[PDB]
Amino acid sequence: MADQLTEEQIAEFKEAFSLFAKAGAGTITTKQLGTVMRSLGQNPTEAELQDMINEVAAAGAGTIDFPQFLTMMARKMKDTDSEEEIREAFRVFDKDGNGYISAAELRHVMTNLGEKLTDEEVDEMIREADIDGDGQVNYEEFVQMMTAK
């Protein structure tokens, strides 16, 4: 099942994971894992790595293959289709048709579904987000503030 995906990564990703070790090749071990993941580029905290290295292990040794190595690093960013989906919702929110949500619009979505939600939370939300000092929020800050947890 193809769905379009970057390539520059898979290219360099394999290279590093391919050129390394010494007594053999094909896969890396816990220790070698970090080594390859390090030269790879980014160098965030080591916590995430630790857990993973111990999570991949399962019915077998600690040697990891390249296919699983990329899947993990790739999953780190979390892959989930949500483009058009959010776009559609964008139209439902905005009423003027543009690239910036306004209070009036936001309130509309609320009062519509009901759930009370007085106009108090609305102004409060704008005070929390808002990239600039504008009583409006761009599609970016909008999506960046959406998807909670």
């Binding site: 989906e85 959010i86 559609e88 919702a89 439902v92 979505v109 609320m110 579904l113 759930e115 939600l117 939370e121 409060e124 939300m125 959406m146 998807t147 909670a148």
Partner: peptide, 21 residues
């Protein structure tokens, strides 16, 4: 039915959550 139903699932979750102060 793949449609706007999904949009609700999203706006719904975020709402019920950020609800409290």
């Amino acid at each position: 039915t793949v449609g706007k139903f999904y949009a609700t699932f999203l706006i719904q979750e975020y709402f019920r959550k950020f609800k409290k102060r």
